[PDB]
């Protein structure tokens, strides 16, 4: 097993994707904030572990560039892989289905039920390729970690296509999420 992730070191993201990166990063932050809230954290001015106060629980537009980058970075990494593969990416006029969807800083993040969104057979297949690439990224890093600890093995150091569903899940869910968000935000990806 020699995992080689798609090399995206020289990929430039075209301007047409900036809207998406900003919107999906905002969504990712809203998800993070809602998860924090469910775990007993609230917004406040000064961070505290003991009081469970998280100054990051505010609107995405109010975050610093470094704070936004936490969310933008992996999204950009995912998009660069699509771009490296030459996948066609187009904004559409009528495809932004999320538009129709029915506290400090007035912040009220809402969940999106992604299980309401369906991917075509071809898009599911493209998501599987993305998932496999996420696995290869992890696997290459793990293979290097082990080699540098003197050796050893790992049950997940096999090709993605030989993993079971439970083992595929983390990477599959990440891949399906970006494709679903592309769809509902008005982008059409094809090959």
Domain positions in the chain: 1-92+122-191
Nearest to 101, CA basis, from 38, 30, 188:
30
Backbone dihedral angles phi then psi of residue 145, each to the nearest 5 degrees = -55, -45
Contacts 24+ apart (CB under 8 A), 179-182: 179/119, 179/123, 179/126, 179/127, 179/130, 180/114, 180/117, 180/119, 181/20, 181/23, 181/24, 181/27, 181/114, 182/20
Query: What is the number of other CB atoms lying within 10 angstroms of the CB of residue 127?
Result: 22
DSSP lists the bridge partners of residue 190 as 88
Q: What is the C-alpha separation between 129 and 123, in angstroms, rounded?
A: 10
What does the angle CA 186 – CA 190 – CA 191 come to, to the nearest 5 degrees?
A: 165
Nearest to 1, CA basis, from 175, 147, 182:
147
DSSP lists the bridge partners of residue 189 as 89
Look up residue 91 and give its DSSP letter. Answer: E
3-state secondary structure of 58: coil
Backbone dihedral angles phi then psi of residue 189, each to the nearest 5 degrees = -105, 135
The answer to whether the CB of 79 falls within 8 A of the CB of 187 is no
DSSP lists the bridge partners of residue 187 as 91
3-state secondary structure of 144: helix
Query: What is the number of other CB atoms lying within 10 angstroms of the CB of residue 136?
Result: 19
> Which residue precedes each gap in the chain (C to N above 2.5 Å)?
102
Q: What is the C-alpha separation between 34 and 32, in angstroms, rounded?
A: 5
The answer to whether the CB of 75 falls within 8 A of the CB of 28 is yes
How many residues are recorded in the chain? 191
The answer to whether the CB of 43 falls within 8 A of the CB of 146 is no
Q: What is the C-alpha separation between 35 and 38, in angstroms, rounded?
A: 5
Tokens 């369906």 belong to: 118
Q: What is the C-alpha separation between 1 and 154, in angstroms, rounded?
A: 11
Residue 49: partners with Cβ closer than 8 Å, 6 or more residues away: none
Let me know if 128 is exposed, middle or buried by CB neighbors in 10 A (0-12, 13-18, 19+): middle
Q: What is the C-alpha separation between 106 and 59, in angstroms, rounded?
A: 8
The answer to whether the CB of 104 falls within 8 A of the CB of 171 is no
H or E segment at 40? none
Domain 1-92+122-191 has CATH 3.50.50.60: no
Method of elucidation:
X-ray
* Max Cα–Cα distance, the chain, nearest Å: 56
The answer to whether the CB of 57 falls within 8 A of the CB of 6 is no
Contacts 24+ apart (CB under 8 A), 153-162: 157/1, 158/1, 159/1, 159/132, 160/131, 160/132, 160/135, 160/136, 161/132
């Amino acid at each position: 097993f020699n995992p080689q992730p798609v090399d995206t070191s020289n990929i430039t993201i075209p301007e047409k994707l900036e809207y998406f990166i900003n919107k999906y990063a905002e969504h990712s932050h809203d998800k993070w904030s809602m998860d924090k809230l469910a775990n007993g954290w609230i917004y406040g001015e000064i961070y505290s572990d003991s009081s469970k106060i998280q100054p990051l629980m505010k609107p995405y537009k109010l975050l610093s560039e470094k704070e936004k980058e936490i969310y933008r970075w992996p999204i950009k990494e995912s998009l660069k892989t699509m771009l490296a593969w030459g996948w066609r990416i187009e904004r559409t006029r009528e495809g932004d289905s999320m538009a129709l969807y029915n506290a400090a800083h007035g912040y009220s993040p809402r969940a999106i039920d992604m299980s309401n969104v369906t991917l075509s057979r071809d898009l599911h297949a493209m998501a599987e390729m993305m998932a496999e690439n996420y696995h290869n990224i992890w696997a290459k890093k793990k293979k290097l970690e082990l080699e540098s600890k003197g050796g050893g093995n790992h049950p997940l150091l096999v090709p993605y296509d030989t993993l079971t569903a439970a083992e595929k899940a983390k990477d599959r869910e990440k891949a399906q999420d970006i494709f679903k968000f592309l769809q509902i935000s008005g982008y059409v990806v094809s090959r």
